[PDB]
Design a protein around this nucleic acid. Structure first.
Ligand SMILES: [Mg+2]
Ligand SMILES: [Mg+2]
Ligand SMILES: [Mg+2]
Ligand SMILES: [Mg+2]
Ligand SMILES: [Mg+2]
Ligand SMILES: [Mg+2]
Ligand SMILES: [Mg+2]
Ligand SMILES: [Mg+2]
Ligand SMILES: [Mg+2]
Ligand SMILES: [Mg+2]
Ligand SMILES: [Mg+2]
Ligand SMILES: [Mg+2]
Ligand SMILES: [Mg+2]
Ligand SMILES: [Mg+2]
Ligand SMILES: [Mg+2]
Ligand SMILES: [Mg+2]
Ligand SMILES: [Mg+2]
Ligand SMILES: [Mg+2]
Ligand SMILES: [Mg+2]
Ligand SMILES: [Mg+2]
Ligand SMILES: [Mg+2]
Ligand SMILES: [Mg+2]
Ligand SMILES: [Mg+2]
Ligand SMILES: [Mg+2]
Ligand SMILES: [Mg+2]
Ligand SMILES: [Mg+2]
Ligand SMILES: [Mg+2]
Ligand SMILES: [Mg+2]
Ligand SMILES: [Mg+2]
Ligand SMILES: [Mg+2]
Ligand SMILES: [Mg+2]
Ligand SMILES: [Mg+2]
Ligand SMILES: [Mg+2]
Ligand SMILES: [Mg+2]
Ligand SMILES: [Mg+2]
Ligand SMILES: [Mg+2]
Ligand SMILES: [Mg+2]
Ligand SMILES: [Mg+2]
Lengths: 200, 95, 85, 113
RNA sequence: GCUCGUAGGUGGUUUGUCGCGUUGUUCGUGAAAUCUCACGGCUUAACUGUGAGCGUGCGGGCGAUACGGGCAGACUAGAGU
RNA sequence: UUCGGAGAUACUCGAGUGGCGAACGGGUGAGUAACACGUGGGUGAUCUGCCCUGCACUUCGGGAUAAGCCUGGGAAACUGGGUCUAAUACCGGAUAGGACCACGGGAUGCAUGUCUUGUGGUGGAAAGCGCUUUAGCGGUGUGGGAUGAGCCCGCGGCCUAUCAGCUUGUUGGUGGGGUGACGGCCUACCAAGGCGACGACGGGUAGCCGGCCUGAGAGGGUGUCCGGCCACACUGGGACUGAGAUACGGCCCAGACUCCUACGGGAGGCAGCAGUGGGGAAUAUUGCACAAUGGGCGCAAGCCUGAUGCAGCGACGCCGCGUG
């Protein structure tokens, strides 16, 4: 399943603009609904819960899928917030967002879901495909000379590209240098209140 | 018509039985002796070393063993319903 | 029976039972004659009954009726029964 | 009779196999005496490995191979080096290999500049 | 309620010894799967292949003797006369 | 050539004899508190078809009989008699040490001893068939492997003392018997023991384990899929055959239940797969295939395989993806 609902509504409740650029948000940054302008009780559980929601609606991950990402992140060496945001940053629909081929996250998900891409010459259509080190991310020859793929040819500049991946010229393809560590991760959220959420 | 007609066996090493030492509790059993063995082992949950005692039977080829009598044993084939041990020798008999 | 080959094998079990029983019944009487001849204390008949009884135990063991260790244990008990006599 | 037989232990549509020394009075996926190789009939040649020194022990003591295992021993040269047939060298063939993960990755950095 | 005492548990100072407990090492064994880890394959995942751990143990061999215990003595502070 | 009668000579093959298999595979968890299982040993106390290899041999004879044919009984299920014919069926000899007895040496130790060799006296096997012209498969005795198995022991895993005296083949010995093997396993005789508050004898419940669930661990709960071992096959008991039997789809007796009968007598056993009824909160198709893997028989082609491979049905679970 997906969410398939209003997107500004879950940025107002979480008090954080999750998509890139929104004029509906910042006219009302307070939570939606009819009791929205309240000064609410900030529980310790509320600060851990709403921090976990900030990552599910940034990346578009259901709860059972997001929990399995936590299962291996707590189980790998290093930290837990480092490795949870790493394996969320390695999903294919997030890689397409960081490379500039899509304006938002939800249009990055369809272009992977509708099968407009390859990775190692292999046709893929799964949005939670996790890329690894040295993975080329190619693109279908049918998907060239298409409107959403050529409307993102001239808009290659307004968003920055992170250091761990790289885009090239008119043969559009994305090269993964290594897995992203921490510093080149975009931060709307802290990474310790998610770890403290699953200890309850 | 070349071979030796007797293939020699692969040398299998003679495995050993179990030898133990204990006192003597009974002797009135007509070429049979009763030996109280004992062994100590940890408790599985608490870790204290618990001392327990068994009572095995053994074969006297000649009835020379009385009460007391540190005796050495070696276990054998079944010799009766309950006898599985044989007397090897008596070291430091009943003082 | 239901399976066709178990009707067949039911017939061959009885023929093997009658064959094994007549051999085993004659071995009892061969031993029994030796036990009476060794109870007479003769050592004349009991020398040559022992040679014919031990020959019959060998032939039963070659016909698969008794086992070869069963022939060995019964020959050794009749031969030692003569050495006491 | 001691048999050298195959043991199905893959997925539903992926029959992986182990070359195992077993008894004939034994089901397929029971206790084998010893595993002496493997066989994956899903690669493009196949993926055949026999231990080939423990195979020479079990053949020299009387283990009869089944008919797929007998074909495998002829490919690996084990049945030929046991019976004395002249084809004792291994006529098995691996797939033509792929360029590795780094070599293709650098050849895209070489082509983009 | 209080004491006496059976089995049992626990035991001062010191010499020598044994190597049962304990501890070191090595061999044999602890099936496969499952589980942990790392790579591979199913478009990804579940699933599955391989490698290494794990399998806390048990048996055999060879070292150590501080502590516990056994055996053979010494001691007087505890205990008793 | 009959105009639907022929020719075993002949590939081929119903029924029959003979061989091998049918003890595996598949199922279930009633019984079982036990050497059942787990783990580690012992077997100088044992067996082991088929398979591999070393070494010997494959020699004379004989009497039947199923089938067939002809008849009798019986409602059936089945069964009687007379003739008739084979064999790798069966039976009897010759020679062949790993049977046996006595005496020997030689090595060996872990007490009974074991292993290897010597003399003397007793002994025990076999089977052929096929062949286009390198068609080829078999037989028996013994050495050694491999494999499967039996048996004994250490240790480990429930509750209950409002169960405290249990035990007479009981505990040990001797002589015989018995078994593949040790052994009160059985028997006679002699001794008077054995076990127990470290729970005997009773009672209650339970297949055990690899594991699974939980938990920071230590623990606690559990034994479902899959894999191992065990137990059973309507209830109870027994043996036969065989290398090997709890003999699911064998036998015999007894019992319950269902069915057939001419009332004299007979038949049956889904806890195999599928399915029906019933019980229940509740658990699926009277499916396809031997293409793969494993097994049985065969020189082989092949034949058999509800093992297995797959499909159907149920959101029953997990995982993944859509509904923009
Ligand atoms: Mg889902
Ligand atoms: Mg037949
Ligand atoms: Mg008579
Ligand atoms: Mg005897
Ligand atoms: Mg009071
Ligand atoms: Mg005391
Ligand atoms: Mg002290
Ligand atoms: Mg003490
Ligand atoms: Mg394992
Ligand atoms: Mg993986
Ligand atoms: Mg992969
Ligand atoms: Mg796996
Ligand atoms: Mg050790
Ligand atoms: Mg004083
Ligand atoms: Mg026929
Ligand atoms: Mg044959
Ligand atoms: Mg069976
Ligand atoms: Mg004739
Ligand atoms: Mg003859
Ligand atoms: Mg002769
Ligand atoms: Mg008596
Ligand atoms: Mg005796
Ligand atoms: Mg006797
Ligand atoms: Mg006796
Ligand atoms: Mg029960
Ligand atoms: Mg706790
Ligand atoms: Mg089960
Ligand atoms: Mg079941
Ligand atoms: Mg029933
Ligand atoms: Mg028999
Ligand atoms: Mg049967
Ligand atoms: Mg049935
Ligand atoms: Mg059924
Ligand atoms: Mg109902
Ligand atoms: Mg088949
Ligand atoms: Mg086949
Ligand atoms: Mg199915
Ligand atoms: Mg579904």
């Amino acid at each position: 399943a997906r969410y398939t609902g209003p997107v500004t509504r879950k940025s107002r409740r979480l008090r954080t603009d999750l998509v890139g650029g929104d004029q509906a948000f910042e006219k009302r940054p307070y939570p939606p609904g009819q009791h929205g302008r309240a000064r609410i009780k900030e529980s310790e559980y509320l600060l851990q819960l709403q921090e976990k929601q900030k990552a599910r609606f940034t990346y578009g991950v259901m709860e059972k899928q997001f929990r399995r990402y936590y299962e291996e992140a707590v189980r790998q060496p290093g930290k837990t917030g480092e490795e949870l945001l790493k394996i969320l940053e390695s999903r294919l629909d997030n890689v397409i967002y960081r490379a500039g081929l899509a304006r938002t996250r939800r249009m990055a998900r369809q272009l992977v879901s509708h099968g407009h891409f390859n990775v190692n010459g292999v046709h893929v259509n799964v949005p939670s495909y996790r890329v690894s080190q040295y993975d080329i991310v190619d693109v279908r020859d049918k998907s060239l000379n298409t409107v959403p793929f050529q409307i993102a040819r001239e808009t290659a500049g307004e968003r920055p590209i992170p250091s761990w991946l790289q885009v090239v010229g008119e043969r559009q393809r994305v090269l993964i240098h290594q897995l992203p560590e921490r510093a080149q991760i975009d931060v709307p959220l802290t990474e310790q209140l998610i770890v403290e959420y699953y200890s309850k | 018509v070349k071979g030796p007609k007797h293939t020699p066996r692969t040398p299998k090493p003679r495995g050993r039985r179990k030898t133990r030492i204990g006192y003597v509790v009974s002797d009135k059993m007509q070429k049979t002796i009763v030996v109280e063995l004992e062994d100590r082992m940890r408790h599985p949950l608490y870790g204290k070393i618990i001392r327990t005692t068994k009572k095995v039977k053994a074969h006297d080829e000649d009835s020379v063993a009385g009460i007391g009598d540190r005796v050495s044993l070696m276990e054998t084939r079944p010799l009766s319903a309950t006898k599985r041990w044989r007397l090897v020798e008596i070291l430091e008999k009943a003082k | 029976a239901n399976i066709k080959s178990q009707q067949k094998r039911n017939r061959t079990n009885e023929r093997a039972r009658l064959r094994n029983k007549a051999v085993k019944s004659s071995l009892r009487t061969a031993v029994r004659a030796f036990r009476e001849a060794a109870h007479a204390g003769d050592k004349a008949k009991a020398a040559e009954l022992l040679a014919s009884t031990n020959r019959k135990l060998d032939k039963a063991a070659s016909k698969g009726v008794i086992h070869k260790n069963q022939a060995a244990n019964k020959k050794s008990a009749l031969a030692q029964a003569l050495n006491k006599l | 009779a001691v048999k050298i037989k195959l043991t199905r232990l893959g997925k539903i549509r992926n029959p992986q196999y182990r070359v195992a020394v077993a008894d004939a009075r034994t089901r397929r996926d029971g206790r084998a005496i010893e595993v002496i190789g493997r066989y994956h009939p899903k690669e493009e040649p196949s993926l055949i490995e026999i231990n080939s020194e423990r195979a020479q022990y079990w053949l020299s003591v009387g283990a009869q191979p089944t008919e797929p295992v007998l074909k495998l021993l002829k490919i690996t040269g084990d049945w030929q080096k046991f019976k004395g047939l002249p084809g004792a060298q291994g006529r098995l063939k691996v797939a033509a290999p792929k360029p590795s993960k780094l070599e293709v990755f650098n050849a895209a950095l070489a082509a983009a500049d």
